[PDB]
């Protein structure tokens, strides 16, 4: 998107699947591309960001408002909350390492939670603001 967005999704994927919680609560089912197979059904997904172009005369940066959705096949979605709670416990104030530039603050934004389809699957989006500096 902006130049940092190649490295940002890579590093927030690496801070995920390293937290001990959400590894005993989701498992290995944290991905962007879905591994085809049986579709385990309590995964998360980390793809849709958008940029709010916060830049400079000398240099330029980006505000990545990336969405991490939590999808859960369970009957209620109290299961999907603690998995999303372990997302938000892992990412606000992250201070991680990027491959192009660095980020300065990984804050938290709106996080809606609803039934996507036939009321069988439950999507909890989690928008995180990622002010990165190129």
């Amino acid at each position: 998107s902006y130049a940092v967005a190649g490295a940002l999704q890579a590093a927030v994927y690496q801070q995920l699947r390293a937290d001990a919680v959400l590894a005993a609560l989701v498992g290995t089912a944290v991905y962007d591309a879905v591994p085809p197979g049986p579709l385990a059904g309590t995964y998360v997904s980390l793809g849709p960001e958008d940029v709010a172009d916060a830049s400079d005369k000398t240099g330029a940066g980006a505000v990545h408002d990336f969405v991490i959705s939590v999808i859960t096949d369970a009957a209620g979605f109290a299961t999907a909350k603690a998995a999303a709670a372990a997302v938000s416990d892992a990412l606000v104030g992250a201070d991680l390492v990027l491959s192009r530039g660095r980020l300065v603050g990984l804050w938290f934004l709106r996080a809606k939670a609803r039934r996507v389809e036939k009321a069988d699957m439950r999507r909890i989006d989690l928008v995180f603001r990622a002010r990165v500096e190129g």
Partner: peptide, 10 residues
């Protein structure tokens, strides 16, 4: 074959 990249996408 699905060679996984660093971001989670194969």
């Amino acid at each position: 074959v699905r060679v996984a990249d660093g971001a989670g996408g194969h």
